[PDB]
């Protein structure tokens, strides 16, 4: 590769006209409009680009070395929390280390295993999703056991497919290499097609489950509208499924459900966009079970807040909500009254987000609070008294795993240097012996104790103080010499939580680099106001926050000048692409946007773009075009600014941002600064991933070595 | 999906399966 050696990219005469509130009609040339299409010409162009990128990476002999180190760092057994089913047996996922899909195991004995003996010594395979297809083209993307433990419902996606299909099997019928060689699959004939974008919710009689589906679509027919919440009865075909709810007048809205443990209530959630606002309707179930013509009580019938059911006791329903409470709280709504009475059960904390609440042991509550972007776990009594903090020395991210009716619960704990701890709380144990560690994840080659994470605060352009995690190998100094990889997402109220990555830690140890995770506005770290601080008309703050983080790393000698690289995916790819356009020349030394939005004027004209109007605004509204257009990366590339080395990565598939965003952005970079001194490249994986499907592990390792090696070489880092 | 493609998800994959 050399500057100016990019594939020829045709420029059309296409112009789109938009209406600006401040400037009236604005004509916007779109010379790469044709990259919106799927054609021979586009295939040759993406092939030329991917060949150019691979040619450049081929010049870098260190990538293969990183692949070896990265594969080894991933090669350690991994496992989930176990779940006790009503058959008395415990089920958990187990991965031998490098398997592409983890395998669902079942305890040999009706007792909690001593997992120190080894998963294969205490459990047998129950469901191995690797055998769904002999060539790995099918993945299990969601599953749910029935409450009585007799059935296992599982959603399957295929390469090339745009929906998932739900299947059902008896829990006494394993799916394994042995079972498929020795006989038929063993599942029921049920085949529930057209499923996507909800969970699977069993009724508590275990007769069936609720799931969202879309209209059947022929190959050359006509978009994803007219979602329906449906009910599937086990042992029937889908033509007998009941439509529980649809709304022809609002064909864009989607649906969720929940069922109360006591069998009394069916709950319906409705969502009109990606804001955290939903309707909440409540139906009473009887002997008649789930039926068409269900009567809904429209308890929450305006879009104003997030409501998610926790549990109920009789007609008193406990709900996690952010109604008038942007850090969230628990309310009760008493349905015994004509006008429901609404009360705070666990009040909002001004400065800590209530992130999750589960009912445990029938009448207790386990709450996770996120304070300064670090999770804290507490146990509450039925009277709302905070009893104890669990795992008080844990620093990182926590989740709860339990079933409300049982006498125990688990916590799953991980963080930058905590690979994966599963703790157990046993209410039947003596009062000082209730909390224990069930399993700790043991990693390979790496020693997590060799790494430190800390949290520092910097100031954004408008004065706002923003926290940022910094992770380093403990021999790395903050003396103005390290490289930094700065990661972000920056949207949709998603929190940039601690997480464990053996590949990142291996990179940090290999090169003496640091990893930086700033909690930029648009995320949900500090509740819904933090999200509102970076969305629609304030979305510019997300970019200012991310740019100020990189400037702070260099100014305060965490990292060397010009040695901050940035990386992010989906919304985080938009973050990366807009950041390199907006920041002063030299702010970044490398950039890897993964599958981002980049045409912020046309994003809502494609597939899943409409739902994002709540996050970015609507380009077709003149007042909103005026704040979108200055931020749109495709429309703000200059000719006078040196760009960092950039490797754009694109994965094709269901539910992913359409790739024309990345295509237009890289075509526009190579048109505007063809002689850039640093390579501006794009790598496309043309396999069509189905919904929820990942790539095989070996491809993931190869892609990681390419990405991190590209960054290392761009920043001048050498293998010691 | 905060870290959905970048890290193995086995640890939390059992939290809500019944």
């Amino acid at each position: 590769w050399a500057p100016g050696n990019y594939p020829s990219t045709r420029r059309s005469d296409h112009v789109d006209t938009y209406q600006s509130a401040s400037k009236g009609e604005v004509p916007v040339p779109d010379p790469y409009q044709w990259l919106e299409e799927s054609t021979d010409e586009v295939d040759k162009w993406t092939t030329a680009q991917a060949d150019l990128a691979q040619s450049y990476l081929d010049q870098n002999a260190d990538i293969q070395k990183l692949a070896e180190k990265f594969r080894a760092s991933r090669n350690y057994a991994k496992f989930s929390a176990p779940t006790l089913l009503d058959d008395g047996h415990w089920y958990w996922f187990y991965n031998r280390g490098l398997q592409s899909q983890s395998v669902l195991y079942r305890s040999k004995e009706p007792a909690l295993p001593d997992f120190s003996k080894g998963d294969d010594n205490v459990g047998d395979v129950f469901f191995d999703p690797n055998v769904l297809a002999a060539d790995g083209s099918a993945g299990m993307v969601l599953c749910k056991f029935s409450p009585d433990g007799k059935f296992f419902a599982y959603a399957v996606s295929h390469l090339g497919g745009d929906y998932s299909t739900i299947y059902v099997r008896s829990t006494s019928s394993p799916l394994s290499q042995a079972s498929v060689a020795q006989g038929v699959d063993g599942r029921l004939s049920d085949e529930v097609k057209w499923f996507k974008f909800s969970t699977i919710i069993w009724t508590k009689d275990s007769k069936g489950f609720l799931y969202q589906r879309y209209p059947a679509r022929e190959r050359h027919e006509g978009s994803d509208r007219n979602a329906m919440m449906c009910y599937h009865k086990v042992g029937t075909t889908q033509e007998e499924d009941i439509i529980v709810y649809q709304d022809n007048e609002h064909p864009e809205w989607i649906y969720g459900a929940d069922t109360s443990e006591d069998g009394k209530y069916l709950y319906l959630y409705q969502f009109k966009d990606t804001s955290k606002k939903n309707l909440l309707w409540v139906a009473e179930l009887d002997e008649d079970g789930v039926k068409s013509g269900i009567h809904w009580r429209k308890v929450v019938n305006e879009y104003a807040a997030d409501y998610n059911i926790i549990t109920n006791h009789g007609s008193l329903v406990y709900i996690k909500t952010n109604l008038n409470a942007p850090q969230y709280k628990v309310i009760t709504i008493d349905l015994s009254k004509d006008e429901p009475e609404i009360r705070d059960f666990i009040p909002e904390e001004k400065d800590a987000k209530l992130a999750q609440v589960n009912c445990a042991n029938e009448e207790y509550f386990v709450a996770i609070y996120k304070r300064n972007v670090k999770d804290e776990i507490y146990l509450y009594s039925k009277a709302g008294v905070q009893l104890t903090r669990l795992a008080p020395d844990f620093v990182g991210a926590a989740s709860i795993a339990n079933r409300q009716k049982q006498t125990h619960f688990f916590l799953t704990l991980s963080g930058f240097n905590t690979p994966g701890t599963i703790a157990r709380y046993d209410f039947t144990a003596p009062e000082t012996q209730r909390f224990s560690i069930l399993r700790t994840t043991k990693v390979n080659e790496l020693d997590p104790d060799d790494f430190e994470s800390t949290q520092v605060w910097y100031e954004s352009k408008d004065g706002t103080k923003i926290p940022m995690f910094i992770v380093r190998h403990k021999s790395t100094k903050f003396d103005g010499t390290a490289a930094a990889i700065q990661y972000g997402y920056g949207g949709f109220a998603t929190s940039a939580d601690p997480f464990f990555s053996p590949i990142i830690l291996t990179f940090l140890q290999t090169y003496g680099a640091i990893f930086a995770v700033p909690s930029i506005r648009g995320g949900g770290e500090f509740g819904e106001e933090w999200h509102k601080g970076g969305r629609r008309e304030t979305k510019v703050n997300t970019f200012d926050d991310f740019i100020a983080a990189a400037q702070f790393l260099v100014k305060n000698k965490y990292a060397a000048p010009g040695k901050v690289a940035i990386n992010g995916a989906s919304n985080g790819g938009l973050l990366v692409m807009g950041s390199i356009v907006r920041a002063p020349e030299g702010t970044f030394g490398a950039a890897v946007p993964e599958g981002g939005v980049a045409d912020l004027l046309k994003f809502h004209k494609f597939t899943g773009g409409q739902a994002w109007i709540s996050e970015y605004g609507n380009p077709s509204i003149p007042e909103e075009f005026d704040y979108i257009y200055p931020l749109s990366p495709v429309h703000n590339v200059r000719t006078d600014k040196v760009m960092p080395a950039t490797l754009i990565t694109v994965n094709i598939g269901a539910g992913r941002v359409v790739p024309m965003h990345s295509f237009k952005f890289i075509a526009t970079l190579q048109h505007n600064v063809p002689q850039n001194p640093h390579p501006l490249l794009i790598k496309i994986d043309k396999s069509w991933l189905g919904h929820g499907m990942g790539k095989p592990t070996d491809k993931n390792v190869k892609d990681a070595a390419d990405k991190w090696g590209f960054i290392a070489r761009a920043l001048g880092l050498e293998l010691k | 999906p905060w870290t959905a493609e970048h890290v193995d998800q086995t640890l939390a994959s059992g939290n809500d399966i019944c």
Side-chain angles (χ1 to χ4, degrees), chain A residues 1-719, chain B:
Chain A
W1 171 89
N5 195 14
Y6 297 117
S8 299
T9 310
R10 180 168 69 88
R11 293 172 61 80
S12 76
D13 59 7
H14 187 91
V15 178
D16 297 309
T17 294
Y18 299 75
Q19 301 103 51
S20 166
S22 69
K23 307 190 153 53
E25 273 203 351
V26 184
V28 179
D30 198 36
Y32 305 116
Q33 184 274 337
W34 63 274
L35 288 169
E36 300 172 3
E37 304 289 350
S38 177
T39 68
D40 170 81
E41 190 194 9
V42 175
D43 292 339
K44 282 153 162 62
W45 177 87
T46 60
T47 296
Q49 294 289 349
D51 286 346
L52 178 61
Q54 188 60 62
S55 169
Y56 186 74
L57 298 167
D58 285 341
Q59 299 174 198
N60 182 345
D62 295 350
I63 292 176
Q64 266 277 88
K65 286 176 179 64
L66 291 185
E68 311 166 2
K69 296 175 185 296
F70 287 169
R71 187 183 305 109
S73 81
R74 298 276 293 243
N75 195 14
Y76 58 92
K78 289 167 271 280
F79 42 69
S80 74
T83 297
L84 173 61
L85 300 188
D86 289 9
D87 67 357
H89 286 254
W90 296 81
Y91 296 66
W92 66 98
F93 287 99
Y94 175 66
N95 191 311
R96 288 161 60 89
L98 297 169
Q99 288 176 287
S100 290
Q101 313 187 47
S102 296
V103 174
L104 190 52
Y105 276 53
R106 173 187 174 275
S107 65
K108 295 178 182 290
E109 305 297 326
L112 179 64
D114 174 4
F115 288 100
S116 76
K117 298 175 176 179
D119 302 59
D120 275 312
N121 289 318
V122 303
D124 302 316
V125 172
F126 166 59
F127 185 83
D128 181 351
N130 295 289
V131 306
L132 285 166
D135 63 1
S137 62
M140 179 186 74
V141 307
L142 191 60
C143 60
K144 195 71 86 81
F145 284 100
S146 64
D148 62 4
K150 286 171 107 45
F151 290 106
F152 175 70
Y154 55 106
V156 176
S157 291
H158 292 267
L159 296 178
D162 278 338
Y163 299 89
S164 300
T165 302
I166 303 169
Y167 296 94
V168 184
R169 337 168 45 74
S170 171
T171 65
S172 70
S173 182
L175 183 72
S176 67
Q177 292 291 348
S179 78
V180 301
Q182 301 165 359
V184 293
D185 173 315
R187 65 171 177 91
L188 300 176
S189 63
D190 308 23
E191 175 177 43
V192 174
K193 295 179 72 177
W194 311 109
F195 164 64
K196 67 180 204 160
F197 295 164
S198 81
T199 56
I200 296 170
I201 301 291
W202 285 87
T203 50
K204 303 307 189 200
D205 58 11
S206 294
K207 293 182 185 295
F209 61 73
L210 294 123
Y211 69 97
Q212 164 170 270
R213 62 161 284 209
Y214 289 69
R217 173 175 158 85
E218 303 280 346
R219 163 64 176 83
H220 306 280
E221 179 181 339
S223 73
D224 283 305
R225 295 166 75 83
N226 299 293
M228 293 160 274
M229 180 57 63
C230 293
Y231 176 77
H232 175 67
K233 177 180 184 76
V234 172
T236 68
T237 65
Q238 196 173 19
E239 308 55 46
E240 311 180 41
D241 289 7
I242 295 170
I243 298 174
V244 170
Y245 193 69
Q246 53 177 336
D247 183 349
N248 298 326
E249 278 76 8
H250 298 105
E252 75 258 52
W253 297 6
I254 61 166
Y255 307 105
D258 262 321
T259 54
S260 70
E261 171 82 1
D262 63 6
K264 184 182 193 189
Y265 291 125
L266 169 64
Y267 306 106
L268 178 72
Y269 307 114
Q270 316 187 31
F271 315 79
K272 68 172 183 183
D273 54 22
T274 57
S275 81
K276 299 296 199 70
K277 293 186 184 75
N278 55 290
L279 309 187
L280 175 60
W281 296 356
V282 182
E284 286 180 340
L285 299 170
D286 54 26
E287 65 217 8
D288 227 308
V290 175
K291 57 183 173 78
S292 58
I294 177 71
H295 182 49
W296 298 111
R297 180 175 185 176
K298 302 177 183 180
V299 171
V300 174
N301 205 28
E302 68 163 327
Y303 283 99
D306 178 346
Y307 298 80
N308 187 70
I309 302 304
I310 301 167
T311 193
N312 64 303
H313 293 298
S315 50
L316 191 65
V317 178
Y318 291 66
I319 305 177
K320 180 170 67 71
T321 185
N322 65 5
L323 178 61
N324 299 320
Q327 297 265 40
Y328 291 72
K329 61 178 179 174
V330 178
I331 60 172
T332 56
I333 296 180
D334 185 343
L335 296 176
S336 69
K337 301 181 65 175
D338 304 302
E339 270 287 337
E341 177 167 275
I342 303 179
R343 287 174 167 169
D344 291 352
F345 175 65
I346 294 173
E348 185 198 20
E349 291 292 326
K350 186 181 170 60
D351 290 306
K353 183 186 185 180
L354 181 63
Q356 184 180 10
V357 181
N358 298 8
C359 182
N361 195 23
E362 285 295 3
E363 74 186 26
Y364 296 74
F365 298 87
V366 182
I368 293 171
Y369 279 92
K370 193 185 299 301
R371 184 180 282 285
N372 296 128
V373 202
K374 293 172 282 177
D375 289 339
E376 311 179 355
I377 307 104
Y378 301 82
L379 182 66
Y380 288 72
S381 74
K382 69 179 180 182
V385 179
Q386 180 184 294
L387 298 177
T388 195
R389 182 165 177 185
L390 304 174
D393 296 318
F394 169 68
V395 177
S399 300
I400 305 162
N402 76 320
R403 302 179 65 201
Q404 164 187 325
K405 73 180 181 181
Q406 296 175 332
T407 59
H408 67 274
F409 67 78
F410 300 97
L411 308 174
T412 59
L413 310 172
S414 71
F416 295 115
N417 57 22
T418 299
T421 292
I422 297 163
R424 177 171 62 109
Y425 185 97
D426 175 6
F427 283 83
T428 72
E431 166 176 317
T432 65
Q433 288 172 319
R434 292 184 164 124
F435 186 78
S436 65
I437 300 302
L438 181 77
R439 311 192 69 165
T440 296
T441 303
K442 286 157 182 59
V443 299
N444 190 41
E445 291 193 2
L446 288 171
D447 185 348
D449 292 339
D450 290 345
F451 300 83
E452 88 156 7
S453 74
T454 58
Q455 190 177 47
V456 306
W457 293 80
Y458 65 100
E459 174 178 349
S460 192
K461 178 180 173 175
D462 69 4
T464 305
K465 304 300 187 177
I466 312 290
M468 171 165 54
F469 297 124
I470 295 175
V471 187
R472 59 164 170 186
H473 184 271
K474 290 179 176 174
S475 298
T476 290
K477 290 187 167 193
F478 297 143
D479 64 355
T481 63
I485 277 77
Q486 173 178 314
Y487 187 82
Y489 184 75
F492 297 101
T494 294
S495 289
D497 288 336
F499 63 99
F500 185 76
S501 172
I503 286 181
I504 289 167
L505 298 180
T506 297
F507 184 93
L508 303 189
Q509 181 172 351
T510 293
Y511 293 108
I514 71 179
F515 185 61
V517 187
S519 304
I520 66 185
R521 281 172 292 183
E525 288 90 344
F526 297 102
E528 185 52 32
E529 290 294 320
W530 205 244
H531 175 223
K532 293 187 175 49
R535 61 102 187 73
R536 297 209 299 269
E537 78 276 3
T538 60
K539 188 63 174 183
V540 71
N541 297 339
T542 299
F543 295 94
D544 289 336
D545 291 351
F546 199 62
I547 292 162
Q551 291 170 328
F552 172 89
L553 291 175
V554 170
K555 183 72 180 177
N556 294 72
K557 301 201 190 302
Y558 294 97
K563 297 209 188 304
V564 179
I566 52 177
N567 166 247
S570 294
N571 195 62
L574 169 60
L575 177 64
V576 167
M577 287 190 272
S579 292
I580 68 177
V581 158
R582 293 179 68 80
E585 169 171 319
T587 301
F588 305 109
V592 180
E594 306 182 17
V597 168
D599 181 343
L600 275 183
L601 296 182
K602 288 194 169 161
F603 77 75
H604 61 311
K605 300 296 183 177
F606 296 80
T607 65
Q610 282 289 327
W612 306 337
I613 286 172
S614 66
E615 188 69 17
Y616 313 129
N618 184 341
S620 306
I621 295 175
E623 297 74 20
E624 309 188 356
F625 176 96
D626 287 347
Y627 68 58
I628 296 169
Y629 188 48
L631 280 203
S632 180
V634 165
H635 305 95
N636 283 285
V637 175
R638 293 175 66 100
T639 62
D640 62 355
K641 191 182 295 176
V642 174
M643 290 292 104
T646 298
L647 174 65
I648 303 186
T649 69
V650 170
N651 295 326
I652 299 300
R656 296 178 181 258
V657 172
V658 293
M660 73 86 187
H661 288 282
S662 292
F663 296 167
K664 286 186 185 178
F665 189 68
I666 195 67
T668 302
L669 288 175
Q670 292 170 358
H671 170 72
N672 275 282
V673 290
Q675 309 299 322
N676 204 56
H678 314 308
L680 308 172
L681 305 172
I682 183 170
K683 210 185 60 151
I684 310 91
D685 182 339
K686 294 176 170 175
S687 175
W688 184 280
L689 296 168
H691 273 293
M693 290 184 76
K695 302 184 191 192
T697 300
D698 59 9
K699 183 58 178 294
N700 282 334
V701 170
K702 183 213 183 257
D703 284 338
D706 284 344
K707 165 169 67 161
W708 289 94
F710 176 85
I711 286 167
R713 159 156 297 206
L715 304 184
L717 305 183
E718 306 284 28
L719 288 176
Chain B
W2 161 233
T3 57
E5 304 175 2
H6 293 165
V7 300
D8 180 286
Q9 298 283 99
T10 303
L11 176 68
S13 68
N15 288 352
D16 180 40
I17 58 172
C18 190

